[PDB]
């Protein structure tokens, strides 16, 4: 077949937790950037978009729209799902956490300005009290290198990626937490992780003020 | 061993998806309510909790938090999840955009009033113009019962229940949507379904103000 096409604006925001697990399973990808309104219009216009919006990866003759369906084509399609129904509950439970929190992380840069200090302090608390706590405890409990099955999965991919955004907005959050720092360098030196932290790879830069007007520039 | 056990407060909200999906499934389950703050603190103290929220389902040995870890539980225990991996692609595409439009309608009682006005119109404007817009030609692609596969699954049942919270806020918004109507007849009288929809059942009604306030007074006492 082909390569798997990502249709988004050239940022992180909802395509980006794909770009790592495709980069993380070791997938070449091409990207088709979604530039100005007009790009976004014609992909609804030619139906290319069930819902009308984006992400929207094609990928194996699909055109595949919702970014949990996207991963979760993909987290199963190279075996980064668990090996059982029980091994998915598990990761699912995991990954909602972590797509609740980044989802807080990608709204942050659209709230009005006088509103996100308090929202950020909000996230930190979050942080700190509920889910490094969480997460830390799954892997304290178990004392394995992965968060589920002792073998890598798509959550130790979206927990590392979520640690590299944590890190963003204030490196002394993971401080208290030795195992999540401990996750995040293991996997950020497979080979795959690796690659894609390397400049000049598919991965995104946070959300700045070009990025953020461009969004606008479109809704 | 046991029947699954919800908790959840008395009502819809979060849990609801999972009420019909067990239902479905022809599964009977328990229910403990969570009536005061008092209730939510000892689950959380307990441990049962993994991001000190709720829903949970006991099942299976298991307390499953997030709703979607849950339902995808479910839905893979009892086969209302397709056949391979590109069938639950699609549901999958398919139920998140009923889960992104149903999140509008949980929130929805949680707004000030406000902002409750343009929610609402918000709602109706998205119900009318994307969503079954989106499934009726789903459903016209291939002129089959279900949404996937030509079984059963999780999508109809998730999307049915939409059509009947669609209904009771407006019952003519799925009028200009005859394959969306044959649906929810179809799936209304499947037996598990039919069941559930019956009067007594743990179907729960639309969320009113006791309900409001009562999930007020345990988050914010
Ligand atoms: C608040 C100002 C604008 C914010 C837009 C944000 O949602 C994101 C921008 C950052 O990348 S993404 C663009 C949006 N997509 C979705 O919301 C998909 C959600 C689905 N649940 C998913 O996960 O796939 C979009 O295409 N919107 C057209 C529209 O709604 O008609
Ligand atoms: C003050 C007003 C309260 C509104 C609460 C609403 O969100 C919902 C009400 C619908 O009945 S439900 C209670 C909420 N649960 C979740 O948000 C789970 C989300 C997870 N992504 C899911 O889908 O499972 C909750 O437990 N909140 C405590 C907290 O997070 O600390």
């Not at 390569?3 to 790592?20: D, V």
């Not at 909000?122 to 997460?135: G, V």
């Not at 400049?199 to 606008?216: A, F, L, N, W």
């Amino acid at each position: 077949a082909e390569k798997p096409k990502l249709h988004y604006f050239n940022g992180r925001g909802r395509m980006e937790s794909t770009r790592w697990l495709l980069a993380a399973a070791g997938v070449e990808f091409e990207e088709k950037f979604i530039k100005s309104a007009e790009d976004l219009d014609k992909l609804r216009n030619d139906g290319y978009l069930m819902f009308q919006q984006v992400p929207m990866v094609e990928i194996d003759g699909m055109k595949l729209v919702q970014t949990r369906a996207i991963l979760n084509y993909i987290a199963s399609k190279y075996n980064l799902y668990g090996k059982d129904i029980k091994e998915r509950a598990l990761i699912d439970m995991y990954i909602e956490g972590i797509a609740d929190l980044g989802e807080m992380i990608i709204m942050l840069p659209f709230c009005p300005p006088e509103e996100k200090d308090a929202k950020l302090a909000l996230i930190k608390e979050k942080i700190k009290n509920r889910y490094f706590p969480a997460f830390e405890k799954v892997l304290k409990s178990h004392g394995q290198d992965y968060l589920v099955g002792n073998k890598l999965s798509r959550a130790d991919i979206h927990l590392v990626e979520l640690l590299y955004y944590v890190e963003e907005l204030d490196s002394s959050l993971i401080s208290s937490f030795p195992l999540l720092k401990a996750l995040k360098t293991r996997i950020s030196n497979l080979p795959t992780v690796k690659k894609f932290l390397q400049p000049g790879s598919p991965r995104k830069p946070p959300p700045d003020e070009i990025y953020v007007r461009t969004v606008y520039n479109i809704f």
